[PDB]
């Protein structure tokens, strides 16, 4: 539902100072807030936004009292953002000439959140703070802020220009800020925000804190306002005498935008004048018009098309029986292979909510499957309308819980077979040993994981599962470009998109020399495209 | 590739095939008729693109351009059709064989050389890209022309001629009370047991086969680049494709001819016909809607040229296997444009298998399409008992989700259970274990679609029953377990809580 979220940003000059060689925290914050605002606006969710800004040259605050609560200006209260807010963001957000303390701005933000929440149901409250921490401040109301958070339980997410802990990349893989560039005020603010967020949440709260550059790389900025989709309340079936009520959830799905492009007139600019229609006429008998109810389907059976209606099919077709979902057989996990995992989406199935006995039963099942390396084939039917499917589900235990994941499995009609040559016997394509060693060296210089010291875990230079789709970002960038200025051609793929899209250049530079090594050691020729 | 295929079927006209040692058993003529109808409908379902013919010999009448006596063709080499099915169907049964003997001749002498000649001639009468040879025969007599040794000589001469001209034959055993006794005249004129019986491969013909088996076709001809200039010829295939019902063929009410579709847009206020140029893409976000045209919309969708650029290497264990988005693809090395790419493919597969690391690679399937990140999963070549590959060599294609594709889940905690119950259903699963095989699970719903389709096409008396395998045989498992299910119910569930609400 509606989330009462407000964004607080300093309008000081400390972050607005032109930082040589690195984008200033003002510009980084502006980029991140523009991304968030365009995402929220083009999602058109029911969450409002208010404009709280401290450090402004003016002073307009609901709790202004001199010295304190100064340089704070509030323009728009918690209403749904529009394109006016976007044009003010790209226009009115300028380097300022006033400094203050962010505690007063947070206090007035929570005050207006509390005031304007009456008369409208809010799912939760949220606020995120963008500060460079390079300004002198008094640690007066931070504890009072924590106490108010305890009695309000407002979601908080923190983002700073400096990295929590090289190549110049925006949101990619590199140091967001050098460890020496932070001043004493920056370190003081870092310690203050660390202890505040520890008091609020803790270590997970520290994980909730990110950098200005790498915030675009992750959806954790939207993690506070996320809402899960619908689920499947049904019952597990084992034989006849055993059954468990379940609430299945779609774990991974290739999400698609709800909004599609319509058609408007070049002059009316509306769908009303446009009237698409479809015409069916007897092409054989000199385009003789055919009624939309005097029309029949058919199917090519053999070397001919057999006439066939529609309603007759559905009254003679196979009939499923509701949302049946029943296990079929028991097989070792080694028998199944990854390449046979079918189904577009990935489903996570769970029992009925808070059914403790069912939860214990399924947990014991999970443990038995894990110890036995065991999986079970299950037939799935969404409802009587759906064509029933079959597949397998396996248990997956995390550090905090255990998960059940179901995947669809194909049929013989789905299976495709082909004859492939034996590359081992291909003496015409047998590499030399030195070429093999060069390939190994290139892989080592190109490998993305090094065995971590002092920890048995394996490092990952490429956390790509937490990178969202950049295609949507480019869509939305070009969308706002057209909305603001429907005159000039569209912007191209900006470089920082590649920066959180490309690999870091360090591995590339490591592989440069072996790249030359193999491209020289391996003769090859190519034909014209 | 290999183009169209031709299958030709030969049955002698003689009273031996109209009679059986046991009258309960079918006649060879009737069993051949029902088997040929079965294989016709199976081929119609499966691979209807190819060419089939029907021809008879030894009759009292002849039908062929060569005008060789008693040589009567019935259906020439054509794609099978339901009319052919029915016009061969009415001759099945006792009355069918009676009406066949009435309107059609049966029982006469001939030569094998002349029937071979005319069948080769009609095979030559096809102007399609031939793929393979299949000229079936059906006889319970191994010595039909041993009376004239010159006839046997010319028959084996013409068989050598066909095998020289790239023609392949095959022989079907028919039941013989004295034993069919192959090698008396065959195994030398053609390309074991005397076979008193007949079932040698007909049992494979009688079983219903329903599939599509898409032929050897490359999914996409793609060029791979490592950094900026390393050019590699690669070929992408799929071992699995979602099977769908054939599209309905829209057609007229009465004449049932396929009506063509006309689609047009016209004005409302003006009433006149609109133009494609006037069409503008429009979406309404906020107060101000967005005016756009399609061409620049796919230009925005256009990001990069098709190609696979290596984004690095990651061990196979680091990726979580539950992350899938699509049926996995499979690439194979090519040497069409780039020469020597297969050597590189071999070297890299060997090195990666030694190092058990995946190969992350940015993926662009087609022009003006958004790119994507894929990891290359190597695959070995596994042979069967007869050293025939069961696991193709090459690389699998796994698909990794983005941040947004991972739907948020409601909070779930960890709950423990007694290890006694754990061992209890360990015993339960050990009771009902088996081994999965991929060749035992079809979609019976599509099978029933087809079943109704031939039922209406051939006016079959009943809608053929779909032999579903997705339904469990609940009685068997309940018998096997019995008093263990209520033991679980008492062990875990409270003895007052029904599983229902």
């Amino acid at each position: 539902n509606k989330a009462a979220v407000v964004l607080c940003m300093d309008v000081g000059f400390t972050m607005s100072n032109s930082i040589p060689g690195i984008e200033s925290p003002f510009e980084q914050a502006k980029k991140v807030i523009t991304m968030f605002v365009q995402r929220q606006v083009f999602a058109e969710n029911k969450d409002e936004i208010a404009l709280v800004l401290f450090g402004t040259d003016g002073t307009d605050n609901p709790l202004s009292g001199g010295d304190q609560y100064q340089n704070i200006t509030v323009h728009r209260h918690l209403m749904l953002p529009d394109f006016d807010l976007l044009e003010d963001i790209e226009s009115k957000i300028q380097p300022g000439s006033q400094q203050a303390d962010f505690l007063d701005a947070l206090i007035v933000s929570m005050d207006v959140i509390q005031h304007e929440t009456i008369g409208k149901k809010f799912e939760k409250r949220h606020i995120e703070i963008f500060t460079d921490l390079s300004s002198r401040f008094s640690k007066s109301q931070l504890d009072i802020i924590i106490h108010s958070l305890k009695k309000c339980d407002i979601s908080l997410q923190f983002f700073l220009p400096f990295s929590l802990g090289g190549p110049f990349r925006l949101g990619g893989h590199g140091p967001s800020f050098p460890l020496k560039g932070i001043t004493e005020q920056q370190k003081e603010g870092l310690e203050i925000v660390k202890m505040v967020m520890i008091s609020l949440e803790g270590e997970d709260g520290l994980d909730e804190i990110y950098s200005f550059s790498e915030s675009l790389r992750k959806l954790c900025v939207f993690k506070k306002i996320e809402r899960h989709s619908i689920h499947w309340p049904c019952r597990l079936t084992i034989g006849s005498n055993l059954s468990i009520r379940i609430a299945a959830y779609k774990s991974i799905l290739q999400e698609r935008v709800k909004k599609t492009w319509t058609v408007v007139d070049a002059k009316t600019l509306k769908k009303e004048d446009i009237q698409k229609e479809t015409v069916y006429c007897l092409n054989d008998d000199d385009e003789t018009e055919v009624l939309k109810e005097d029309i029949i389907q058919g199917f090519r059976y053999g070397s001919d098309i057999v006439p066939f209606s529609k309603v007759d099919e559905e009254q003679m077709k196979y009939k499923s029986e509701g949302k049946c979902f029943s296990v079929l057989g028991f097989c070792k996990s080694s028998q199944v292979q990854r390449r046979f995992f079918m189904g577009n989406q990935v489903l996570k199935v769970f029992a009925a909510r808070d059914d403790e006995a069912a939860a214990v039963a399924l947990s014991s099942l999970i443990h038995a499957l894990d110890d036995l390396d065991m999986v079970a084939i299950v037939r799935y039917a969404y409802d009587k309308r759906a064509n029933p499917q079959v597949g397998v589900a396996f248990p997956h235990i995390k550090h905090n819980y255990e998960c059940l994941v179901y995947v669809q499995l194909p049929f013989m009609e789905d299976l495709r077979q082909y004859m492939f040559s034996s590359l081992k016997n291909s003496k015409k394509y047998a590499p030399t040993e030195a070429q093999l060693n060069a390939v190994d060296a290139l892989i080592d210089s190109m490998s993305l994981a090094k065995k971590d010291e002092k920890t048995d875990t394996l490092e990952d230079l490429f956390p790509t599962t937490k990178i969202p789709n950049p295609r949507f970002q480019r869509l939305f960038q070009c969308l706002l470009h057209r909305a603001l200025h429907p005159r000039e051609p569209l912007p191209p793929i900006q470089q920082h998109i590649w920066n959180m899209l490309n690999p870091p250049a360090e591995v590339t530079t490591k592989s440069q020399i072996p790249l030359s090594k193999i491209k020289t050691l391996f003769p090859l020729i190519e034909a014209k495209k | 590739y290999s183009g169209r295929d031709s299958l030709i079927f030969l049955v002698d006209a003689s009273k031996a095939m109209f009679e059986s040692q046991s009258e309960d058993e079918l006649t060879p003529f009737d069993m051949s008729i029902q088997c040929i109808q079965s294989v016709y409908i199976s081929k119609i379902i499966s691979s209807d693109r190819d060419l089939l013919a029907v021809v008879f010999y030894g009759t009292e009448k002849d039908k062929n351009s060569v005008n060789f006596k008693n040589i009567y063709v019935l259906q020439e080499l054509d794609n099978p059709g339901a009319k052919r099915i029915l016009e061969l169907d009415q001759f099945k049964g006792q009355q069918g064989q009676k009406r066949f003997q009435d309107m059609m001749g049966h029982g006469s002498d001939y030569s094998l050389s002349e029937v071979l000649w005319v069948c080769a001639n009609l095979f030559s009468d096809v102007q399609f890209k031939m793929s393979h040879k299949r000229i079936m025969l059906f006889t319970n007599e191994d010595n039909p022309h041993g009376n004239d040794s010159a006839k046997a000589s010319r028959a084996r001469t013409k068989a050598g001629d066909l095998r020289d001209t790239g023609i392949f034959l095959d022989l079907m055993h028919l039941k013989k009370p004295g034993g069919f006794d192959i090698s008396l005249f065959y195994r030398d004129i053609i390309s074991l047991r005397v076979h008193f019986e007949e079932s040698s491969k007909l049992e494979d013909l009688l079983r219903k086969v329903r599939a599509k088996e898409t032929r050897k076709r490359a999914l996409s001809r793609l060029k791979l680049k490592l950094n900026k200039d390393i050019v590699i010829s690669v070929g992408i295939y799929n071992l699995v494709q979602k099977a769908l019902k054939p599209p309905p063929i829209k057609l007229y009410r009465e004449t049932n001819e396929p009506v063509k579709t006309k689609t047009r847009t016209f004005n409302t206020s003006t009433g006149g016909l609109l133009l494609p140029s006037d069409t503008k893409r429009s979406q309404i976000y906020g107060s101000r809607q967005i005016i756009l045209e399609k061409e620049e919309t796919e230009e925005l969708k256009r990001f990069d040229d098709p190609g696979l650029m290596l984004m690095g290497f990651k061990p196979l264990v680091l990726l979580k296997k539950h992350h899938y988005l699509r049926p996995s693809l499979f690439v194979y090395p090519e040497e069409s444009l780039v020469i020597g790419s297969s050597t590189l493919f071999s070297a890299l597969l060997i090195k990666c298998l030694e190092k058990e690391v995946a190969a992350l690679c940015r993926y662009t399937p087609r022009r003006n399409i958004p790119p994507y990140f894929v990891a290359l999963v190597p695959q070995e070549e596994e042979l069967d008992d007869q050293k025939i590959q069961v696991t193709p060599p090459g690389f699998q294609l796994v698909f990794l989700p983005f941040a947004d594709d991972k739907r948020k889940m409601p909070f779930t905690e960890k709950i423990m259970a007694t290890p006694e119950q754990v061992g209890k259903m360990k015993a339960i699963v050990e009771k009902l274990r088996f081994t999965y095989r991929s060749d035992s699970f079809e979609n019976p719903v599509l099978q029933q679609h087809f079943r109704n389709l031939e039922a209406l096409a051939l006016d079959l008396m009943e809608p053929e029953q779909a032999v579903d395998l997705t339904l469990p045989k609940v009685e068997a498992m309940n018998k096997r377990l019995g008093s263990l299910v209520d033991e679980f119910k008492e062990l875990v569930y409270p003895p007052d809580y029904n599983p229902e609400g």
Partner: peptide, 23 residues
């Protein structure tokens, strides 16, 4: 050739769908 579809050259023979056989 054994192991190949007698009804379809270039394709393997397919054994009919069986379902399950518990142990």
């Amino acid at each position: 050739c054994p192991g190949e579809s007698l009804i379809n050259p270039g394709f393997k023979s397919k054994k009919p769908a069986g379902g399950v056989d518990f142990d």
